[PDB]
Ligand binder design. Sequence first.
Ligand SMILES: CNS(=O)(=O)c1cnn(-c2ccccc2)c1C
Ligand SMILES: CNS(=O)(=O)c1cnn(-c2ccccc2)c1C
Lengths: 369, 369
Amino acid sequence: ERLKVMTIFGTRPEAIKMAPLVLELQKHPEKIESIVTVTAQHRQMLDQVLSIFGITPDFDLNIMKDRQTLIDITTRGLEGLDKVMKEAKPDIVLVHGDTTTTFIASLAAFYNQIPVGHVEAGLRTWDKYSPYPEEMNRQLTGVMADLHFSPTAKSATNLQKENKDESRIFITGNTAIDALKTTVKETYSHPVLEKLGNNRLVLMTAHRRENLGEPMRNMFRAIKRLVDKHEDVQVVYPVHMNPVVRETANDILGDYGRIHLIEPLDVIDFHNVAARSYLMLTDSGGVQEEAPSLGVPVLVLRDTTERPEGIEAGTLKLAGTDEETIFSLADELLSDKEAHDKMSKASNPYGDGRASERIVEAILKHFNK
Amino acid sequence: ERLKVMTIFGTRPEAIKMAPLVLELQKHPEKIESIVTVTAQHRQMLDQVLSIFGITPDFDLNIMKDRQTLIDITTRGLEGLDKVMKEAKPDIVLVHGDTTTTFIASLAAFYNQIPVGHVEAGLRTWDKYSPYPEEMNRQLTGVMADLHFSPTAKSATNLQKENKDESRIFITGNTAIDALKTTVKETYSHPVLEKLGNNRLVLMTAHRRENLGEPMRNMFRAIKRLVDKHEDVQVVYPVHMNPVVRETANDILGDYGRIHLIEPLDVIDFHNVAARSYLMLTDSGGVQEEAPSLGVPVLVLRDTTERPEGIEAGTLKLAGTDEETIFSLADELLSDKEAHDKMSKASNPYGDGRASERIVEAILKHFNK
Ligand SMILES: CNS(=O)(=O)c1cnn(-c2ccccc2)c1C
Ligand SMILES: CNS(=O)(=O)c1cnn(-c2ccccc2)c1C
């Protein structure tokens, strides 16, 4: 008699994070009945991802979060998920991250005396109101969880500090990394990629509120100096621009066709483009965790990092927001094939692409299957 | 402009445990606006206890429990508690113990950024299905609470180990002890006491489910021998009759006129009868923590205890479930005034009647009032 594992997809960014885990569950059809519940409001991108991974949802709930109060989401989500669990009778419910839906998915499981496995567990701020409600959500979910799937030792330590049972805490790595063997296809085309030759690609992303104004100008001025010094380098900046910010770009960069400002990429095209990049400049937390597993050095357009383990492993370097520092560090890595290759080969500490395997193994052990 | 302090009374037993806190809040009318919110379905006795304490609720919600599901109580409760907290806008909400109402009151407060003071905090079995849902409710309430008022070091230590802010963890004692200053009258009449006259009362309490079978039969054989060896003793067992008991009773206890099986007592009657008791035989945690403040030696009808502090202080002794140890220990206390008086004058480690004082002092300091 098969172990019934229900996986919740509660938000769009969970598609990439939970689809690899479902794919791994679907590799044990003899021991495991994989049941997929989607509750996310926005479906186009998620549905795109589930299809790439050959996943068909067993339950679709519409839980609205457009101008909706926590109270309404909490009560209507609790009802909705409780019904799904009374019907499908899972042996375990797997929930991701710090969302209100993960909290109520766990509470509904508890209210049916069904075990919960918490994917991406142990992130702590220790500030109940920052973020709000996310910190409290991950604590609430933490007390209800039977199994904790921590992406890093620090997250596992946080959970140990709360006197959680060590035998129920697993350092798995980050499941998003696991997606890459599915999403990244050797036979992949993009306009931006055609324009690039055997030319070295610098992929740059900045979307942080704090990088508006001078920091963007410093970035653009640094990029100008880089493409002038390195003639075999093209730069890709997928962002959407205000006209006046466009004029600023054009004024600094000119129109010499080796810097491509393009519209923001979907996750799939991003993965595939990042995978063919020589260097990355980012202010994104997630790129810091993911892009190194593609063998891409990551320079972080910030003064401080919330990813200390990437720094330590040498997968990441801080570039700050000063023109000089951004130019200095990018130039080092584009000049010295040795120092690029080094960061390119450093092991990603946020995982090795087997987080889903470790989660499934931990579940089978726990249930004596 | 006064600190607005909302105390929640979600159930009839909480009445006794929270009324003294309210009395204490009402002694600071310059600094504190005491708001009392009652959410229980059954109010008769709650109102009785409220009346004795001189407390008038400000808010009355009817959260129906009888034949209601966890989900229904959870959604309706959360809606009604949110509404009342937007209506009153208190600076802090006080909640007791491990009820579902405490949990949802804490969530409603969190969803309005209102601080939670958790009365009777830190009790742990670490088994999420025993008791269900009480263990998880107090764990859930615990992550959401700003101030924790633990009856004992043991419960305070459980919170410390969960990495709670030591500055928010207070060992206050048990507020139920506080209640006795008010509920126990110098003079009191009740059938039990009329029929007692100048006889020594042994007062027995036993849950019927956990003492079902050989235990109760053993307690019956033992109390029978007690009255056989002591002509001046009456045994009173408040129990909800069922021809099971009747047959068990009449079979062992007989009709010699000094063992009375009576209908369960309301808390005020109980306190006032226990306050006139020579000895208590009990399996009640509350009786273990409260009765000793009345100077009553307490024998615990259990082979195992989760209240070791009372054992060590000398206010409690483990009597077991077997006839011979129950008899032997009660017989002793009835046959040796010294042994009785020793247990009777032993200091109650669960509190000194000033728990409410300590709770209010903590609130005031926390708000720098
Ligand atoms: C939406 N703009 S974009 O084209 O720069 C893009 C697409 N996916 N990502 C991304 C990939 C992994 C982790 C976090 C984020 C970015 C930064
Ligand atoms: C319901 N049966 S009864 O009459 O023996 C009774 C009344 N109040 N109590 C009681 C008193 C304090 C703490 C806990 C429980 C009992 C055990």
